[PDB]
A paper describes a structure:
Here, we report PET‐degrading α/β hydrolases, including HaloPETase1 from the marine Halopseudomonas lineage, thereby extending the narrow sequence space by novel features at the active site. The enzymatic degradation of polyethylene terephthalate (PET) offers a sustainable solution for PET recycling. HaloPETase1 is a salt‐tolerant enzyme and depends on higher salt concentrations for the degradation of PET at elevated temperatures. We propose an extension of this PETase classification system by type III PETases that include HaloPETase1, 2, 3, and 4, as well as PmC and dsPETase05.
The crystal structure of HaloPETase1 was determined to a resolution of 1.16 Å, revealing a unique active site architecture and a lack of the canonical π‐stacking clamp found in PETases so far. HaloPETase1 has the canonical α/β hydrolase fold illustrating highly conserved spatial positions for its catalytic residues S156, D206, and H236 as known for IsPETase (type IIb). There are two disulfide bonds observed: Db I (C64‐C126) and Db II (C273‐C276). While two bonds are characteristic for type II PETases, these are, however, located at different positions in HaloPETase1. Notably, we could not observe a disulfide bond flanking the active site, as it is known for IsPETase. In HaloPETase1, on the other hand, we observed the non‐conserved aromatic acid Y180 in subsite I (equivalent to W185 in IsPETase), which might form a π‐stacking interaction with the substrate. However, instead of an aromatic residue at the equivalent position of Y87 in IsPETase, we found T88 for HaloPETase1. Thus, the so‐called π‐stacking “clamp” does not exist for HaloPETase1. Further, we hypothesize that the backbone amide protons of T88 and Q157 are responsible for the formation of the oxyanion hole in HaloPETase1 since these residues are located at equivalent positions as M161 and Y87 in IsPETase. In contrast, HaloPETase1 has a distinct and extended loop (loop 3) due to an insertion of five amino acids.
Residue numbers in the entry: 20 to 287
The structure:
């Protein structure tokens, strides 16, 4: 949380990659947003103007929970877009293999590399993260093996079925912000998340939110919204103010009794 600008009604300085600073990770940011279909089988939520002020936009690829669509998560996806991310959701309700998510990344790469178009030279292909809920959180871990996925944020992942291959957990490309809810009886954290924490080959920040059901991530994603935004702003925008959300002995979530935190490979 620590920011030299002091937040609030002040004006926090730009991030390391040049994106506007924000006074809150849970409130929407300064970019007006739009959404629409992308490549037939994806849906994008993005700033309505891309590439202003010399910026190249980081990307979050999203996988839905079982039975769900991108609209089920429109609040959280629009929220990230309002901070400056280009957010691409696989449309599928069956995101567990990770392949649809990676196809959405391939699609945006093509568009970035065109001479003209919505995305032409406007994306930062070195700053891609993955996130998703439920089976889509398992799919985030599956997709997170790919060398282009810099960090992941699985929201209540389901890893005991629905396309998951648990060996993916030990083949991640980058660090993981693993989120669970203590009231989640559908993707039991003991069965679905504890094994990921144990076997992951990367640093893991595992936060379990007290009193969160399996439906906390739907819509605007509740009390996961701010933390997930901090994670992606830190790693994909070099927002230094998000560092002490996760790192150090006195990190924000570490001293917040609403969270049970288990870390590995994270400076503490």
């Amino acid at each position: 949380s620590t920011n030299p600008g002091g937040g609030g009604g002040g004006s926090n300085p730009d991030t390391g990659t040049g994106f506007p600073g924000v006074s809150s990770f849970s409130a929407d940011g300064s970019f007006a947003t739009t959404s629409g279909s992308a490549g037939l089988s994806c849906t994008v939520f993005r700033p309505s103007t891309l590439g202003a002020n010399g910026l190249k936009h980081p990307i979050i690829v999203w996988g839905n929970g079982t039975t769900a669509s991108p609209s089920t998560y429109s609040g959280i996806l629009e929220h990230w877009a309002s901070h400056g991310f280009v957010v691409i959701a696989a449309n599928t309700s069956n995101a567990g293999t990770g392949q649809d998510m990676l196809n959405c990344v391939d699609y945006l790469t093509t568009q970035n590399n065109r001479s003209t178009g919505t995305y032409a030279n406007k994306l930062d292909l070195n700053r891609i993260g993955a996130a998703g809920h439920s089976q889509g959180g398992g799919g985030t871990i599956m997709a997170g093996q790919d060398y282009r996925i810099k960090v992941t944020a699985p929201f209540q992942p389901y890893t005991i079925g629905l396309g998951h291959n648990s060996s993916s957990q030990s083949n991640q490309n980058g660090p993981m912000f693993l989120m669970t809810g203590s009231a989640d009886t559908i993707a039991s954290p003991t069965l679905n998340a504890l094994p990921v924490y144990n076997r992951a080959n990367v640093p893991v920040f595992w936060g379990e939110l007290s009193g969160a059901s399996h439906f906390e991530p739907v819509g605007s994603a509740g009390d996961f919204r701010g933390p997930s935004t901090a994670w992606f702003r830190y790693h994909l925008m070099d927002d230094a103010s998000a560092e002490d959300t996760f790192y150090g002995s006195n990190c924000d979530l570490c001293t917040d009794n609403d969270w049970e935190v288990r870390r590995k490979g994270i400076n503490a």
